[PDB]
Amino acid sequence: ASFDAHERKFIVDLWAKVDVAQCGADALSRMLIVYPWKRRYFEHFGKMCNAHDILHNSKVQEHGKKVLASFGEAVKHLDNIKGHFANLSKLHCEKFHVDPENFKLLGDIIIIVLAAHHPEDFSVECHAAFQKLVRQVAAALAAEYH
Amino acid sequence: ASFDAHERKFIVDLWAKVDVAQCGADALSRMLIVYPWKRRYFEHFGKMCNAHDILHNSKVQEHGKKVLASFGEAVKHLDNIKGHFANLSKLHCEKFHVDPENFKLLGDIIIIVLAAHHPEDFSVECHAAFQKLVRQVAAALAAEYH
Amino acid sequence: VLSMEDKSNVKAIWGKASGHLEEYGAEALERMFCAYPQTKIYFPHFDMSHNSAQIRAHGKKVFSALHEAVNHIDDLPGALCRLSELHAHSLRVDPVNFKFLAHCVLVVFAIHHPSALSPEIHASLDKFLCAVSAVLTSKYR
Amino acid sequence: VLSMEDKSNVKAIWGKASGHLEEYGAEALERMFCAYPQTKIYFPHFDMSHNSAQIRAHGKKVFSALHEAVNHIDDLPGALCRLSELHAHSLRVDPVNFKFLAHCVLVVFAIHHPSALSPEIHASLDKFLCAVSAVLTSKYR
Ligand code: HEM
Ligand code: HEM
Ligand code: HEM
Ligand code: HEM
């Protein structure tokens, strides 16, 4: 479903306040601490044997910045989410072999990271607009698993 | 995703051979025998205490014909599934209070009923086109739960 | 299932919920209703307005049940049997909805206690809510 | 979990699969790969052509494992431990994929044995496959 003008104002106005470098590093560290098995997809980043290693691993920190920077391009393409992420869907399927069920779990972690960093902006209605965005980005990333 | 011409030919050519009255009664009876709790939504149909009752209940038989007749209108609106089922989504939400996760389970039963009735048409590739149709009809029926 | 570190992590974050069971419980239901509006099919009788008396009263009940589960974290199947039969048989609430609420509960803690809900505590609290969700689901099938 | 009627229903439908474990197993994997192509991420090494030697060999293995589970239907946790650790730890296969395969297994029986897979037998076989899926998932979390 397309974003109404109310949804569009919540998303666009909060994303202007987000520190994308910090929140992305936070979300990827949380994904690898809350789901420790998924480290399998990132073993080439080196030391990740426990939460302290993960939080000080710089390859994890930089990967998190790029992932959330990529998610943040959805805010400029709210009417074309499926079409914007088609190349990146195909790479997660054919190259990284990542189960498309995992896109929802990272999306749910991003919502928690945003809630913690912006407690007064993340109202019930702001949260609902962001959950709709994470649902659509997850679906778009799952869409070229042919 | 839109149906390609190959998908469209599988769906359109098999649906011309379907006995909608028989297959619908079969699918609703199977839904109430495989998931016996869902009888809660249909108690006004009367006797449903066991599988023999369900298979001889005429209100179940007729309801099954109408449900599969409704699903069969998707075959005429393959480019507009979401828009065709919007009124029927809103009725399942506001009137029948049905959890939208259940639309996938009936869709999976419809695939089994079709496989059993048309064993030589229901090829690996025909099955894949039908699973894509049941996925889209389920999503369209879940879409007006506001 | 839960480690001794998970159990102590969970008892620590939950002590911050003490004194705010109605407030935190009410906000987590308001978040579930707005972000996952399909969940309103189970509450056809409720006023769904903000800080509705019925939402306040249900929020207090859910969070009190979670408070008792933290106290009996060693035997969740025995602490939650009465609720397990209510959810899985009388209301027949589908398993996916429990995931939606556990997520709204994690957002409420993150909003009110950002620093307390560290990545390690987040990991433990997610694990505890999944376990609570599985006892309320164990007889739904 | 499974009733004595479910167990005898399951042993009856499965006797029709006898002599066709490679054929039925191969068709159920071909159906999963085509109807749920996301499942191909787990099999990057396989030739995915029809009646590929690798698909035939894996189809025989999955159906043989299900044959042993029907024989040990009273204690599925003990019959499937070796596979449980392989799936839930070494391959870390997500729980939703098990549902996709159990559905492709029900379609293969429906195609080859339409009359045998009556609504009551369908109900029992769905229940057995969910139980098998849960033993292969029990340590994934
Ligand atoms: C919000 C969802 C996601 C977004 C927007 C996202 C975005 C990205 C981006 C932009 C890249 C870099 C592509 C390149 O420049 O080559 C990437 C790589 C990768 N992603 Fe994701 N991703 C997401 C979710 C996930 C999830 C859930 C997993 C696994 C659990 C995952 C695993 C990977 C892996 C393994 C790589 C390759 C890393 C490397 O070798 O450098 N992604 N993703
Ligand atoms: C393929 C998916 C589905 C389709 C196309 C479908 C279609 C229909 C149709 C056409 C009606 C009649 C509407 C009217 O004329 O007033 C209806 C009613 C109903 N449906 Fe569905 N339905 C589907 C799935 C389900 C599921 C999964 C459930 C519950 C488990 C369900 C429960 C109901 C109930 C309770 C009614 C009202 C019955 C009555 O009082 O007569 N539906 N549906
Ligand atoms: C952490 C998970 C949950 C806990 C601890 C929980 C706890 C409770 C409790 C304590 C009650 C009241 C029981 C009583 O008054 O005797 C209850 C009732 C209820 N719960 Fe839940 N619940 C949970 C999840 C859910 C979810 C996910 C749904 C639906 C989306 C749900 C729907 C209901 C409903 C409909 C009632 C009856 C409401 C009423 O009319 O008062 N519950 N639950
Ligand atoms: C009824 C459910 C299942 C059963 C009984 C089953 C059984 C088996 C068996 C017997 C093996 C071979 C173990 C061995 O060779 O020692 C195996 C391997 C495997 N299974 Fe499954 N399996 C099931 C479901 C699934 C699903 C849903 C997936 C993925 C979508 C999956 C992916 C795999 C993979 C990737 C392997 C390793 C494949 C290889 O390279 O040979 N399995 N499973």
From Swiss-Prot, chains A, B:
Heme b binds at H63, H92. The keyword Heme applies. CDD domains: Hb-beta-like (cd08925). GO terms for biological process: hydrogen peroxide catabolic process. It comes from the Eukaryota. The modification N-acetylalanine is found at A1. Heterotetramer of two alpha chains and two beta chains. This is Hemoglobin subunit beta. It comes from Alligator mississippiensis (American alligator).
Curated annotation (Swiss-Prot), chains C, D:
Heme b binds at H87. Keywords: Heme, Iron, Metal-binding, Oxygen transport, Transport. It holds the Pfam family Globin. It comes from the Eukaryota. One of its GO terms (biological process) is hydrogen peroxide catabolic process. O2 binds at H58. Residues 1-141 form the Globin domain. PROSITE patterns: GLOBIN. GO terms for cellular component: blood microparticle; haptoglobin-hemoglobin complex; hemoglobin complex. One of its GO terms (molecular function) is peroxidase activity. Involved in oxygen transport from the lung to the various peripheral tissues. PANTHER family: HEMOGLOBIN FAMILY MEMBER, HEMOGLOBIN SUBUNIT ALPHA. Heterotetramer of two alpha chains and two beta chains. Belongs to the globin family. This is Hemoglobin subunit alpha. It comes from Alligator mississippiensis (American alligator). The gene is HBA.
